[PDB]
Amino acid sequence: AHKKGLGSTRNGRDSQAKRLGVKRYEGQVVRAGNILVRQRGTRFKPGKNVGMGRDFTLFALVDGVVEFQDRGRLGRYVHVRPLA
Amino acid sequence: MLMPRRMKYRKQQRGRLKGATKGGDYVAFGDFGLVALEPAWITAQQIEAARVAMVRHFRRGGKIFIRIFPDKPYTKKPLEVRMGKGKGNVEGYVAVVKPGRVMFEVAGVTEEQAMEALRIAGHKLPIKTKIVRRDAYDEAQ
Amino acid sequence: MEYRLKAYYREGEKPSALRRAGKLPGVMYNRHLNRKVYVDLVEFDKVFRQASIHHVIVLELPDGQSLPTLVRQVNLDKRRRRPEHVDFFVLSDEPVEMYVPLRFVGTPAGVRAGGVLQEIHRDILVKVSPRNIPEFIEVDVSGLEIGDSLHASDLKLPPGVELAVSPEETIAAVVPPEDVEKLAEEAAA
Amino acid sequence: RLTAYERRKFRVRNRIKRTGRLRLSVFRSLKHIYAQIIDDEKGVTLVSASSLALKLKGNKTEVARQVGRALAEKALALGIKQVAFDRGPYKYHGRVKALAEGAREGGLEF
RNA sequence: GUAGAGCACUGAUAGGGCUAGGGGGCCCACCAGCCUACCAAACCCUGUCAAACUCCGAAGGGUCCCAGGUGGAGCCUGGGAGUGAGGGCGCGAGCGAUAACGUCCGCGUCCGAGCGCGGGAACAACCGAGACCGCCAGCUAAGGCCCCCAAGUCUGGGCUAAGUGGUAAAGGAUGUGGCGCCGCGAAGACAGCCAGGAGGUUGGCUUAGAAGCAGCCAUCCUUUAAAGAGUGCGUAAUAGCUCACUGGUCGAGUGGCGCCGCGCCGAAAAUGAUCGGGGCUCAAGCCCAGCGCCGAAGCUGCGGGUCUGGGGGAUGACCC
RNA sequence: GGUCGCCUCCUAAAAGGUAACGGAGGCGCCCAAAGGUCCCCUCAGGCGGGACGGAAAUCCGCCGGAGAGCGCAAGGGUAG
RNA sequence: GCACCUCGAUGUCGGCUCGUCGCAUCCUGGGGCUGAAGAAGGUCCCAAGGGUUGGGCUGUUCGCCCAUUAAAGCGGCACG
RNA sequence: UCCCCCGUGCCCAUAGCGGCGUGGAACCACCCGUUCCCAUUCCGAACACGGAAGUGAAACGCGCCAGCGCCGAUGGUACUGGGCGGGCGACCGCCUGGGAGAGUAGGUCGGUGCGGGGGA
Numbered sequence A: 001a002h003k004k005g006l007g008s009t010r011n012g013r014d015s016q017a018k019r020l021g022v023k024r025y026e027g028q029v030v031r032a033g034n035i036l037v038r039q040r041g042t043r044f045k046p047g048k049n050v051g052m053g054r055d056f057t058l059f060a061l062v063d064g065v066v067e068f069q070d071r072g073r074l075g076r077y078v079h080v081r082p083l084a
Numbered sequence B: 001m002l003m004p005r006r007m008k009y010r011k012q013q014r015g016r017l018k019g020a021t022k023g024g025d026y027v028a029f030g031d032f033g034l035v036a037l038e039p040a041w042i043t044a045q046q047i048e049a050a051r052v053a054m055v056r057h058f059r060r061g062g063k064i065f066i067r068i069f070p071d072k073p074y075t076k077k078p079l080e081v082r083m084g085k086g087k088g089n090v091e092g093y094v095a096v097v098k099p100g101r102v103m104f105e106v107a108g109v110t111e112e113q114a115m116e117a118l119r120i121a122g123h124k125l126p127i128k129t130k131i132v133r134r135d136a137y138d139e140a141q
Numbered sequence C: 001m002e003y004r005l006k007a008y009y010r011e012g013e014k015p016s017a018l019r020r021a022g023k024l025p026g027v028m029y030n031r032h033l034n035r036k037v038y039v040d041l042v043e044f045d046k047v048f049r050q051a052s053i054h055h056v057i058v059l060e061l062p063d064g065q066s067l068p069t070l071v072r073q074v075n076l077d078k079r080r081r082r083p084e085h086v087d088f089f090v091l092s093d094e095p096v097e098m099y100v101p102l103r104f105v106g107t108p109a110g111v112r113a114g115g116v117l118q119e120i121h122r123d124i125l126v127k128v129s130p131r132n133i134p135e136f137i138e139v140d141v142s143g144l145e146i147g148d149s150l151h152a153s154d155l156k157l158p159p160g161v162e163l164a165v166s167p168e169e170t171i172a173a174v175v176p177p178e179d180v181e182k183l184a185e186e187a188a189a
Numbered sequence D: 001r002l003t004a005y006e007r008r009k010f011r012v013r014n015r016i017k018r019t020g021r022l023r024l025s026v027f028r029s030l031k032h033i034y035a036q037i038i039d040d041e042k043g044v045t046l047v048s049a050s051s052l053a054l055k056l057k058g059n060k061t062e063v064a065r066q067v068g069r070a071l072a073e074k075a076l077a078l079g080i081k082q083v084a085f086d087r088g089p090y091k092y093h094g095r096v097k098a099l100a101e102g103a104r105e106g107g108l109e110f
Numbered sequence E: 001g002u003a004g005a006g007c008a009c010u011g012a013u014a015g016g017g018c019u020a021g022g023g024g025g026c027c028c029a030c031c032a033g034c035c036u037a038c039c040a041a042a043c044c045c046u047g048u049c050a051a052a053c054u055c056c057g058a059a060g061g062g063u064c065c066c067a068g069g070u071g072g073a074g075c076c077u078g079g080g081a082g083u084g085a086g087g088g089c090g091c092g093a094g095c096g097a098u099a100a101c102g103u104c105c106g107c108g109u110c111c112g113a114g115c116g117c118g119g120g121a122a123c124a125a126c127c128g129a130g131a132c133c134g135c136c137a138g139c140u141a142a143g144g145c146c147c148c149c150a151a152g153u154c155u156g157g158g159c160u161a162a163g164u165g166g167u168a169a170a171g172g173a174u175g176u177g178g179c180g181c182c183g184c185g186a187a188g189a190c191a192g193c194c195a196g197g198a199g200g201u202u203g204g205c206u207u208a209g210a211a212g213c214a215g216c217c218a219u220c221c222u223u224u225a226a227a228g229a230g231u232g233c234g235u236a237a238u239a240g241c242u243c244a245c246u247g248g249u250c251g252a253g254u255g256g257c258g259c260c261g262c263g264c265c266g267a268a269a270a271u272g273a274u275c276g277g278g279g280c281u282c283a284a285g286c287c288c289a290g291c292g293c294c295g296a297a298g299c300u301g302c303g304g305g306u307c308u309g310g311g312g313g314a315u316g317a318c319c320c
Numbered sequence F: 001g002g003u004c005g006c007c008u009c010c011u012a013a014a015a016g017g018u019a020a021c022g023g024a025g026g027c028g029c030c031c032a033a034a035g036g037u038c039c040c041c042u043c044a045g046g047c048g049g050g051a052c053g054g055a056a057a058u059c060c061g062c063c064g065g066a067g068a069g070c071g072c073a074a075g076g077g078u079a080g
Numbered sequence G: 001g002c003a004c005c006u007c008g009a010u011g012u013c014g015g016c017u018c019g020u021c022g023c024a025u026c027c028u029g030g031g032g033c034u035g036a037a038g039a040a041g042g043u044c045c046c047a048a049g050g051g052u053u054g055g056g057c058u059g060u061u062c063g064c065c066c067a068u069u070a071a072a073g074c075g076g077c078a079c080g
Numbered sequence H: 001u002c003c004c005c006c007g008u009g010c011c012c013a014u015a016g017c018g019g020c021g022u023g024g025a026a027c028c029a030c031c032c033g034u035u036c037c038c039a040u041u042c043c044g045a046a047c048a049c050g051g052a053a054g055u056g057a058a059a060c061g062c063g064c065c066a067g068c069g070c071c072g073a074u075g076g077u078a079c080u081g082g083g084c085g086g087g088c089g090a091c092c093g094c095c096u097g098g099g100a101g102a103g104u105a106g107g108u109c110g111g112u113g114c115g116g117g118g119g120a
């Protein structure tokens, strides 16, 4: 009594989750090595004591809080400011 | 019939119709007008039947302004199929009106010749409607 | 002629309550002043339809000082098409711009022998002093034919009122009318 | 829009301003040639040998040579050592070049 | 980067302006001039649409620091599980048909396991409320206070006349109430009762006779204290004559649009009916206000049991 | 019948995450230069300009912040 | 369409028997309008009380046909 | 300490597009040359170098305007965390806290820190 010439979708595919975005926040203690932001292309720019990996990952180079800075047309930056 | 002459995407989602319109709640071309009192989708089928209605009212003469366009794909699953196995094929095209949005305007037409006109065109519509004339509130807008 | 209506003050009561209470909030404001107010709706309604945004109205405050006003944007309640706020521009002696009612007069030679015009631009933007507030802007139109038009570089303009839009902007045009003979080849497509 | 000059500045400048080291900003004029020493982290200049201040003359590249020898002594008095040579839009050849190897004559490390 | 919102980009888009080539006469170009109620690129102004558009952008939500927070909190290490069919409702989306007691996710709740208790007629998940035991004690909650049924035939103001209330939409109507706005009113209004309802109105109109109503078009000019190459019953055709029209008479109001409250029509189903029933009409209905009181296993009162922390005990027991 | 792993985007409710036989697309390779560095440089496009020569070969001019390009899908990024 | 009771069982189509109920009425009863002269007929309203034939063909319901009729009504009742 | 200048940092176009001006003793630039170092898929255009005759035309500098771009309120509204009522529904209303986008009034032809080289 039922089904007839049922159209098959050409899609229904999908990507994995990349779990990207910002991982550490301003005024958050970090140590050297930590990852501060995962991204795909500097939405965030490598500040002082902040390095950038082969996929545009942004990791701390020394300890003490992260800190976000917004230099308008130049770019968004994040640096780490060492201990005390 | 009022179909989009080129299309970025095929089928398109439903989306609910919360609230008042986004624009065109004030007349801007014609002297009088027709407006939504209640939200719906309007078929190209409907729209064209309202146009043709008025056009036949002042046979030979008058100019009709119509301020909504069927840009949404009204999809629909074929007859007697079960759920799934994809989305319906696109059966029609509809336009999203919310309350306040102006649909039909006229110019070069008498008073009642645009009352009776925009009356009947109201009747070829799935919704309660008000007719309102151009006003300063529209000029200030 | 000139226009006038009451205009009591507000320190910001409930715009909700106030609007319900038979009246209407809004603000009086210019380069020098800036003041919360509220007029009566029904009296405003009475006043605005004829005055609008091209005739200068004046506002009698409770503290007297009747300042020359001109409206800068009315707020229409989209669902109900009823006002809910008025931006009230007090005029100093300046070329402070505003739109003035265009007067297409002598009905086009396109019309009576064809269709009908289209008032693309009921009024026109123009720099001029508070003094010169033209009640009309008589501009001929009886020469414009079917499928023709004119632009803002085609205006009378009384003295001092020299236009603040553009000479390329269009003003009015006569269009072909909706023949039912057209209807045949329309939906037969 | 930017100039070949303007781009080339930043291009090599930024390569260096992000090294942390004291940047020795040069300037090549057709007249004579000078250069200061900037701790960009703040923004202050550390010291500033020149050819208008030292008011010397006698061949551009030999007075380019000298000004660095000024820089060397006059900076090494303030315990300066970490040197990063901002070579500006100009290259590393002849004029600005000699200033460097002259700045090296004193003890400056770079 | 969401709701909103905006076209600044990606695309849609209605009109108009302006303008390529197409289309098309003018030319008939062998080619130029093209003119445009034609099609219409970019382009402009008005006006818009978009999950996969973004010049913008909330409420919020994350996350760290700092502070409150002693909670059948949180954390580390181990022993033991069960679970891995969920469902409904609210809200936010997709799919579906802006269908389903449908389906698929997100947040929350409740059922599950609270089919224990009060409302809801009855009824897992709607409202109220988390049942240790006892009481012929008391305050309440939702909901209620004519009678079945505990407690108001309470109180004041207003609407409704259909049993609407007690099941419905487009659309329709001098319903009844209540606001506007406009128009005609003793420059005698509406309504009827009426001297009148004149002319080269000698109808432009030829055919069994078309002197006012199929006869196709200045829809012809008259005394204007009063009018139609005919609204008219005679209607291709003598009688007879209605009114649009005017004058009296009448002597105060009347016609029109719009909005708001509550009704009316729209409204046809299968075993016997019904709002839970009887029954209710200045309510026993609807709104607005106010005050009592009834009402649960919630809260309180009194007696007890129990586990936990606490003190006693400067001791298990025992006591608060 | 279709599907089965991977990546992009949307659904996804402005953190991460989130389903459906939801809506749209790609991958199973490629590059000893397409790589490392150092130096250097700057698009698409549009208008005018010019033998062949063009809507678009190449040369000249003025306007261009990024709509080009970045091997190939899409998003982010990106000429400092 | 959904997958809610029923798979430790709720026997399917059609016929026969018996019906009974709905009214959106085939017949007869009663009305309005008619492009109703009359007769006849049309469409709409009211009205469910009763009535609503016999055969050919085919498993059929349906349907076609034959001969009649005032009419040869549909539908619900686990398509009783 | 005040001013002009050069080399530079910083806010992030209120800075910018454009037009109008003025600045050469200083400093900067064009300008002089190809000998030398160096240099062009061709060219001293550029990079380089030796210079100081010309100049302020270009660029740059200080400035002026508001045509463009830019920034841009107050008021109100959309929306909404939370708390309620409302409709068959599509959906609508009230409370409390938060509260835009457009648009309006208006602002804008920059603002500065470090050193150096001139002026008093």
Ligand SMILES: [Mg+2]
Pocket: A001
């Ligand atoms: Mg079957």
Ligand SMILES: [Mg+2]
Pocket: A015, A016, A017
């Ligand atoms: Mg993804």
Ligand SMILES: [Mg+2]
Pocket: none
């Ligand atoms: Mg405020």
Ligand SMILES: [Mg+2]
Pocket: C147, C148
């Ligand atoms: Mg045209």
Ligand SMILES: [Mg+2]
Pocket: C147, C148
């Ligand atoms: Mg023309």
Ligand SMILES: [Mg+2]
Pocket: none
């Ligand atoms: Mg268009």
Ligand SMILES: [Mg+2]
Pocket: none
């Ligand atoms: Mg267009």
Ligand SMILES: [Mg+2]
Pocket: none
């Ligand atoms: Mg068109």
Ligand SMILES: [Mg+2]
Pocket: E019
């Ligand atoms: Mg043209």
Ligand SMILES: [Mg+2]
Pocket: none
């Ligand atoms: Mg969006």
Ligand SMILES: [Mg+2]
Pocket: none
């Ligand atoms: Mg903003």
Ligand SMILES: [Mg+2]
Pocket: E058
């Ligand atoms: Mg904000």
Ligand SMILES: [Mg+2]
Pocket: none
């Ligand atoms: Mg504890």
Ligand SMILES: [Mg+2]
Pocket: E077
């Ligand atoms: Mg351990």
Ligand SMILES: [Mg+2]
Pocket: E077
């Ligand atoms: Mg252990």
Ligand SMILES: [Mg+2]
Pocket: none
């Ligand atoms: Mg262990």
